[PDB]
Structures are given as C-alpha cells and as structure tokens.
Amino acid sequence: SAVQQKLAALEKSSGGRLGVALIDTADNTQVLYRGDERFPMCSTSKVMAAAAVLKQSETQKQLLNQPVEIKPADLVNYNPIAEKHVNGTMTLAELSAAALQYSDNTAMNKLIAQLGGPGGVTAFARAIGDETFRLDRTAPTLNTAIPGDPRDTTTPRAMAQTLRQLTLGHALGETQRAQLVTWLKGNTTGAASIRAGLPTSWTVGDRTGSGDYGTTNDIAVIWPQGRAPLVLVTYFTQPQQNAESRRDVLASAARIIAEG
C-alpha cells in the first residue's frame, strides 16, 4: 500500500526499527507495519496494569479509594508524582493516574504489587484474550529494551487490539472503561508523539513509553471529529544501546496514517 511504503521510507530515514498498527473502528480495517514483530513495551505496559486493577475494582467496589503508603524505599529512578507523597499515601486511583499521565515508575510498581507481581499483569492480558503481551520485570528494569530479549514485549497488532477492547470494547465494566478513557485523555507526556501528528481538533488519549536503545513508544485511542474512533500503536527502537529519544518518528508515522 501507499501507507506501508511511506512508513517504510520513514523507517529508513530514521535509522531504527518502526512498528505500526492502526484499527479503524468505522469499518474494522487494520493497517500494519511490522505488526507481528516484538518491541519492548516500556511504559506502554502501564495501560495493562491499570486496567487489571480496574478489573479488580469490578468486584472490590471501593478499591480505587484504598490508600497506599509511599515510602522512601519505594522510590525508583523516575517518580514525578510519587516523590510528592513520600511519607504519605496515595489511593490506587491516584497511583493509576500517576502511571498513566506522568509515566511514574513508582506508581507502576505499586500497581504491579497490587496484582501479585508481573505475572498478575500478564494474567489479565490472557484473561482478555491477549496471547502476546508479557510483563516480566518491574520498573525501571523492564526498560532495558534489548534486541532479541522477549521480556516485557508485545507486538503492535496485539497491543492495538487490546487497547481497543479496553477503551472502546467491553473487556472492562462500563464505569471502569470510562475511568480508563478519562485517565488516558489527561496524559501529559504525549504532546510530542502521536498527538503531534494528528489534527488539532481530534481528541486523543494516549500512553507513551521510553527506554534504552532509544526506544520510543506511543499507543493511542483517537476520536476524530465526525468519524468513528481510531486505535493507533507506534513502536520504535534503535540499534545503539545509548540512542536518544525519537518522538518525532511517532508523530511522523501518525501524520502518515492520518493522511491515508
């Protein structure tokens, strides 16, 4: 297709490896580029962890309001919200928002602990039919992003299908689905990624990821004005362990997709 050829050209100009999956909910069409190759998820895995806790809240009705102590020993490498609440508490809802809207790694680790470890996050993926997602480590070691390492990986196709089922489908209860959408629409970290390549009037909820090997990710649910919603996953990784972030590549892929 023309879109796949422009994405292929983008990838060549970038010096890295690009993976894209688009789902059009208008006619259920899919556009894929390296859609079945594995990429390190990095912080895009936070969506599965928050959704698994939302799923627990369907039976534990008050769960999102439960306070969780934040201790100095809990802090890891990137804790923009958790550091504000040391020697205090945050609710599970506040921790979910911190992970999803600020990429907070201490918050992610609290969600994983609430699910019984990384295997509890992968478990929720399996329960909703995602056979590809695997979470193996906590943050930040899940961001090592080493080529050929299957740990903490998924494919663009699997992630797009899962994001659709969580935000637009019915993998979650209706209040939980709305909560997850609200959280994603308020993300603060994606202004230079998928959002920077789409029309300014569209509404977007997104979750970014970043890691070693210059890994730069974004997964988004997109509401175009006057069109059925879209789900778009853009994953990007580079040959050098120390490569810099390339959010511009995700914006360019989103622009390529949107024009097609």
Short mmCIF file of C-alpha atoms in Angstrom, two decimals:
data_model
loop_
_atom_site.label_atom_id
_atom_site.label_comp_id
_atom_site.label_asym_id
_atom_site.label_seq_id
_atom_site.Cartn_x
_atom_site.Cartn_y
_atom_site.Cartn_z
CA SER A 1 0.00 0.00 0.00
CA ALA A 2 0.95 3.64 -0.27
CA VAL A 3 0.80 3.94 3.53
CA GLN A 4 3.13 1.00 4.09
CA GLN A 5 5.58 2.41 1.58
CA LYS A 6 5.64 5.82 3.30
CA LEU A 7 6.08 4.11 6.67
CA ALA A 8 8.90 2.04 5.19
CA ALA A 9 10.55 5.23 3.94
CA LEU A 10 10.11 6.89 7.33
CA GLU A 11 11.81 3.90 8.93
CA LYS A 12 14.76 4.09 6.54
CA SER A 13 15.22 7.80 7.21
CA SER A 14 15.11 7.17 10.97
CA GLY A 15 17.95 4.67 11.34
CA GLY A 16 15.76 2.45 13.53
CA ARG A 17 13.02 -0.20 13.56
CA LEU A 18 9.40 1.02 13.41
CA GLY A 19 6.24 -0.91 14.20
CA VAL A 20 2.72 0.41 13.50
CA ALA A 21 -0.81 -0.95 13.95
CA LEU A 22 -3.92 1.06 13.13
CA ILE A 23 -7.52 -0.03 13.75
CA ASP A 24 -10.35 1.90 12.12
CA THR A 25 -13.49 1.19 14.11
CA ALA A 26 -15.63 2.57 11.25
CA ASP A 27 -15.11 -0.49 9.03
CA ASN A 28 -12.81 -2.64 11.23
CA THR A 29 -9.92 -2.16 8.83
CA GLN A 30 -6.33 -2.64 10.00
CA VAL A 31 -3.10 -1.13 8.68
CA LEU A 32 0.04 -2.87 9.95
CA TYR A 33 3.78 -2.28 9.58
CA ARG A 34 5.93 -4.88 11.35
CA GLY A 35 2.65 -5.55 13.15
CA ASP A 36 3.68 -9.01 14.34
CA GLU A 37 7.26 -8.16 15.39
CA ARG A 38 8.04 -7.78 19.09
CA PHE A 39 9.03 -4.44 20.58
CA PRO A 40 9.90 -3.53 24.18
CA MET A 41 6.69 -2.02 25.58
CA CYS A 42 8.41 0.21 28.16
CA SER A 43 5.81 2.43 29.90
CA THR A 44 3.09 1.48 27.42
CA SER A 45 2.69 -1.61 29.64
CA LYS A 46 1.19 0.71 32.29
CA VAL A 47 -2.15 0.51 30.45
CA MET A 48 -2.45 -3.23 31.08
CA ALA A 49 -1.50 -2.81 34.75
CA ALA A 50 -4.01 -0.01 35.40
CA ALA A 51 -6.71 -1.94 33.56
CA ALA A 52 -6.04 -5.07 35.61
CA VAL A 53 -6.60 -3.04 38.77
CA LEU A 54 -9.76 -1.53 37.28
CA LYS A 55 -10.87 -5.10 36.62
CA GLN A 56 -10.33 -5.98 40.30
CA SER A 57 -12.43 -2.94 41.24
CA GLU A 58 -15.41 -4.52 39.46
CA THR A 59 -15.78 -6.83 42.49
CA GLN A 60 -13.87 -4.80 45.11
CA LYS A 61 -16.10 -1.80 44.55
CA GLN A 62 -14.12 0.59 46.80
CA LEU A 63 -10.66 -0.49 45.61
CA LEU A 64 -9.73 2.70 43.74
CA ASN A 65 -10.11 4.65 47.01
CA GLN A 66 -7.78 2.48 49.04
CA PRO A 67 -4.76 4.39 50.39
CA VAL A 68 -1.28 3.05 49.70
CA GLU A 69 1.69 4.26 51.73
CA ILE A 70 4.58 5.74 49.72
CA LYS A 71 7.91 5.13 51.46
CA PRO A 72 11.38 6.47 50.60
CA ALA A 73 12.49 2.89 49.84
CA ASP A 74 9.68 2.60 47.27
CA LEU A 75 11.16 5.29 45.03
CA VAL A 76 13.00 4.22 41.89
CA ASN A 77 14.51 6.22 39.01
CA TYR A 78 11.57 8.31 37.76
CA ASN A 79 8.88 9.23 40.30
CA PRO A 80 7.39 12.63 39.37
CA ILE A 81 4.19 12.18 41.41
CA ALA A 82 5.20 9.56 43.97
CA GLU A 83 8.02 11.80 45.22
CA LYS A 84 5.35 14.37 46.18
CA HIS A 85 3.67 11.91 48.55
CA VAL A 86 6.57 10.28 50.36
CA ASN A 87 5.64 9.57 53.99
CA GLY A 88 2.03 9.96 52.93
CA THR A 89 -0.45 7.89 51.00
CA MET A 90 -1.90 7.83 47.51
CA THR A 91 -5.06 5.98 46.56
CA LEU A 92 -4.94 3.28 43.90
CA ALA A 93 -6.78 5.73 41.60
CA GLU A 94 -4.13 8.38 42.18
CA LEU A 95 -1.41 5.82 41.53
CA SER A 96 -3.15 4.71 38.33
CA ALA A 97 -3.37 8.32 37.19
CA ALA A 98 0.27 8.94 38.05
CA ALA A 99 1.43 5.97 35.97
CA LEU A 100 -0.85 6.72 33.03
CA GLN A 101 -0.49 10.54 32.97
CA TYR A 102 3.10 11.10 34.13
CA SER A 103 4.92 7.80 33.38
CA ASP A 104 5.56 7.42 37.14
CA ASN A 105 7.55 4.24 37.73
CA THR A 106 6.93 4.02 41.47
CA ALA A 107 3.22 4.19 40.71
CA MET A 108 3.60 1.38 38.16
CA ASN A 109 5.37 -0.74 40.78
CA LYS A 110 2.50 -0.23 43.24
CA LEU A 111 0.02 -1.39 40.59
CA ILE A 112 2.15 -4.48 39.91
CA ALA A 113 2.36 -5.25 43.64
CA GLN A 114 -1.44 -4.95 43.89
CA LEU A 115 -1.73 -7.59 41.13
CA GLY A 116 0.69 -10.00 42.81
CA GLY A 117 3.69 -9.30 40.59
CA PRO A 118 4.35 -9.03 36.85
CA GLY A 119 2.62 -12.39 36.32
CA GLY A 120 -0.64 -10.84 37.53
CA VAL A 121 -0.48 -8.22 34.77
CA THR A 122 0.25 -10.83 32.10
CA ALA A 123 -2.61 -12.85 33.58
CA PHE A 124 -5.11 -10.09 32.89
CA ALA A 125 -3.89 -9.91 29.28
CA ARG A 126 -4.57 -13.64 28.90
CA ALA A 127 -8.00 -13.29 30.53
CA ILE A 128 -8.99 -10.70 27.88
CA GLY A 129 -7.54 -12.78 25.04
CA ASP A 130 -4.12 -11.13 24.53
CA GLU A 131 -1.76 -14.07 24.00
CA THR A 132 1.24 -11.89 23.04
CA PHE A 133 1.74 -9.42 25.89
CA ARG A 134 4.26 -10.44 28.53
CA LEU A 135 5.40 -8.42 31.54
CA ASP A 136 8.42 -9.97 33.29
CA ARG A 137 10.03 -7.23 35.41
CA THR A 138 9.14 -4.18 37.46
CA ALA A 139 10.15 -0.63 36.62
CA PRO A 140 12.64 0.51 35.59
CA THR A 141 14.42 -2.72 34.62
CA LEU A 142 11.60 -3.53 32.20
CA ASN A 143 13.01 -0.66 30.07
CA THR A 144 16.27 -2.47 29.13
CA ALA A 145 14.81 -2.95 25.63
CA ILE A 146 17.50 -5.41 24.46
CA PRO A 147 17.20 -6.81 20.90
CA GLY A 148 16.04 -10.43 20.80
CA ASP A 149 15.02 -10.33 24.50
CA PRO A 150 11.35 -11.38 24.76
CA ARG A 151 10.95 -9.94 28.26
CA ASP A 152 8.47 -7.07 28.57
CA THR A 153 7.43 -7.15 24.91
CA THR A 154 4.33 -7.20 22.76
CA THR A 155 3.52 -6.70 19.07
CA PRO A 156 1.85 -3.64 17.51
CA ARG A 157 -1.12 -5.74 16.34
CA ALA A 158 -1.70 -7.33 19.75
CA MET A 159 -1.42 -4.02 21.57
CA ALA A 160 -3.82 -2.22 19.23
CA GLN A 161 -6.42 -4.99 19.60
CA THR A 162 -6.03 -4.93 23.38
CA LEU A 163 -6.27 -1.13 23.62
CA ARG A 164 -9.45 -1.20 21.55
CA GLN A 165 -11.06 -3.84 23.78
CA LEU A 166 -10.15 -1.88 26.94
CA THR A 167 -11.14 1.63 25.86
CA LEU A 168 -13.85 1.07 23.24
CA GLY A 169 -14.88 -2.57 23.70
CA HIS A 170 -16.08 -4.33 26.82
CA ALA A 171 -13.07 -6.02 28.42
CA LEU A 172 -13.79 -3.72 31.39
CA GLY A 173 -17.01 -2.80 33.15
CA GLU A 174 -18.63 0.40 31.90
CA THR A 175 -17.53 2.66 34.77
CA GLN A 176 -14.02 1.19 34.60
CA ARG A 177 -13.82 1.73 30.84
CA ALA A 178 -14.87 5.36 31.25
CA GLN A 179 -12.30 5.83 34.02
CA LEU A 180 -9.51 4.45 31.84
CA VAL A 181 -10.51 6.72 28.97
CA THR A 182 -10.58 9.72 31.30
CA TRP A 183 -7.10 8.86 32.55
CA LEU A 184 -5.67 8.45 29.04
CA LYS A 185 -7.19 11.68 27.77
CA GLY A 186 -5.33 13.52 30.54
CA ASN A 187 -1.88 12.11 29.80
CA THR A 188 0.75 14.84 30.00
CA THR A 189 3.68 13.05 28.30
CA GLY A 190 2.47 12.55 24.72
CA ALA A 191 2.43 16.06 23.23
CA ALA A 192 5.46 15.36 21.01
CA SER A 193 4.38 11.82 19.93
CA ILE A 194 1.18 10.57 18.20
CA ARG A 195 -0.63 13.77 19.20
CA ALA A 196 1.88 15.96 17.35
CA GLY A 197 0.99 14.28 14.04
CA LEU A 198 -2.82 14.44 14.18
CA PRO A 199 -5.33 17.26 13.52
CA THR A 200 -5.51 19.68 16.44
CA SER A 201 -9.29 19.23 16.79
CA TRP A 202 -9.12 15.47 17.39
CA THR A 203 -9.44 14.10 20.90
CA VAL A 204 -6.69 11.66 21.93
CA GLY A 205 -5.98 9.54 24.98
CA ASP A 206 -2.52 8.06 24.92
CA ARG A 207 0.26 6.32 26.84
CA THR A 208 3.91 6.81 25.87
CA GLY A 209 6.92 4.63 26.61
CA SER A 210 10.64 5.21 26.57
CA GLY A 211 13.61 3.04 27.29
CA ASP A 212 17.13 2.01 26.38
CA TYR A 213 18.17 1.50 22.76
CA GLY A 214 16.40 4.83 22.19
CA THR A 215 13.09 3.01 22.42
CA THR A 216 10.24 5.49 21.86
CA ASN A 217 6.60 4.30 22.00
CA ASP A 218 3.04 5.61 21.95
CA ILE A 219 -0.35 3.86 21.99
CA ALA A 220 -3.47 5.96 21.47
CA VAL A 221 -7.23 5.96 21.17
CA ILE A 222 -8.28 8.77 18.84
CA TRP A 223 -11.69 10.38 18.41
CA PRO A 224 -11.78 12.27 15.10
CA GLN A 225 -14.50 14.91 14.93
CA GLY A 226 -17.30 13.39 12.87
CA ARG A 227 -15.74 9.97 12.31
CA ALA A 228 -15.67 6.66 14.15
CA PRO A 229 -12.73 6.39 16.59
CA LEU A 230 -9.30 5.02 15.74
CA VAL A 231 -6.75 2.99 17.70
CA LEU A 232 -3.10 3.58 16.77
CA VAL A 233 0.07 1.94 18.14
CA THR A 234 3.52 3.24 17.11
CA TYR A 235 6.61 1.46 18.48
CA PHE A 236 10.19 2.48 17.68
CA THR A 237 13.61 1.17 18.68
CA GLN A 238 17.17 1.79 17.56
CA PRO A 239 20.40 -0.18 17.06
CA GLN A 240 22.53 1.68 19.66
CA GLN A 241 22.05 0.99 23.36
CA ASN A 242 22.51 4.71 24.10
CA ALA A 243 20.38 6.21 21.30
CA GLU A 244 18.38 9.34 22.10
CA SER A 245 14.57 9.54 22.14
CA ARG A 246 12.84 9.99 18.76
CA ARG A 247 9.25 11.09 19.47
CA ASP A 248 9.28 12.87 16.07
CA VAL A 249 9.25 9.47 14.37
CA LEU A 250 5.96 8.59 16.08
CA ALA A 251 4.45 11.94 15.13
CA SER A 252 5.53 11.40 11.52
CA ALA A 253 4.01 7.92 11.48
CA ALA A 254 0.75 9.29 12.89
CA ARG A 255 0.74 12.01 10.24
CA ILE A 256 1.34 9.38 7.54
CA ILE A 257 -1.53 7.28 8.89
CA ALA A 258 -3.92 10.20 9.24
CA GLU A 259 -3.44 11.42 5.67
CA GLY A 260 -4.28 7.90 4.45
#
